[PDB]
């Protein structure tokens, strides 16, 4: 076969979760096959076939999304988590069935050792459930699952020959030319 037409090894991405910004992509050397010397002619075609059967990014996105749709640790509570999120707020605070006396006497009041307005249960749950005031993400920062659904490992044949896109190792392009920077 001719190796100029060989399917390139994919570019798998690097995430850097601590910051959350993308940390670049690498040639997928971590998963590759030793075939040129020992495999010879019969395994050159096999390796090319394996490389060109690498899933296109949309398929990888779908598989990853289906993978973390079965996690059990979604960012938001499912029925299992919200059942016990509701269970305590229903049983939190002063009991609703407690018939405690109200004594509006200016002299000679009761002691109320215990243990007249009351908050509704719906509002009680609303306090526990309400999210932040941000409600909008930061540009460039994304979560691990969010980063894996985007930034998909895919073959990039003939990457470094276009007009002026080059690549994203660890950079920020500002001057209309690829300036891999933050030196």
């Amino acid at each position: 076969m001719n190796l100029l037409n060989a399917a390139p090894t994919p570019y798998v991405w690097k995430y850097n979760p601590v910051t959350g910004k993308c940390a670049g992509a690498q040639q997928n050397y971590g998963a590759t096959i030793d075939w040129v010397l020992p495999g010879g002619n019969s395994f050159a075609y096999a390796a090319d076939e394996i490389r060109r059967r690498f899933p296109e990014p949309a398929v990888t996105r779908a598989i990853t999304a289906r993978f973390e749709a079965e996690s059990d640790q979604q960012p938001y509570a499912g029925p299992h988590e919200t059942n016990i999120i509701t269970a305590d707020v229903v049983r939190s605070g002063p009991p609703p069935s407690a018939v405690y006396p109200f004594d509006p006497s200016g002299v000679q009041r009761v002691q109320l050792s215990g243990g007249p307005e009351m908050t509704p249960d719906a509002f009680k749950y609303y306090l526990r459930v309400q999210g932040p005031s941000q409600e909008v993400d930061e540009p460039g920062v994304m979560s691990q699952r969010q980063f894996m659904t985007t930034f998909l490992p895919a073959m990039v044949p003939h990457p470094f020959d276009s007009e002026s896109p080059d690549a994203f190792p660890a950079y920020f392009s500002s001057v209309y030319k690829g300036t891999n920077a933050f030196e």
Binding site: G93, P94, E117, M118, T119
Partner: protein, 49 residues
Amino acid sequence: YTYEWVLRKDPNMILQSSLGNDLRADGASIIYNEVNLMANFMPMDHNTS
């Protein structure tokens, strides 16, 4: 909540000298008899707490 802790009994650690001499060799010692845990609770209304 169960909340434990451990207190140092080392005389050099707990006690500070104006000379920095060895207090273990100089008869210093400590005995803890009662060690309680104080706490202040704000009596805010239960409907508010």
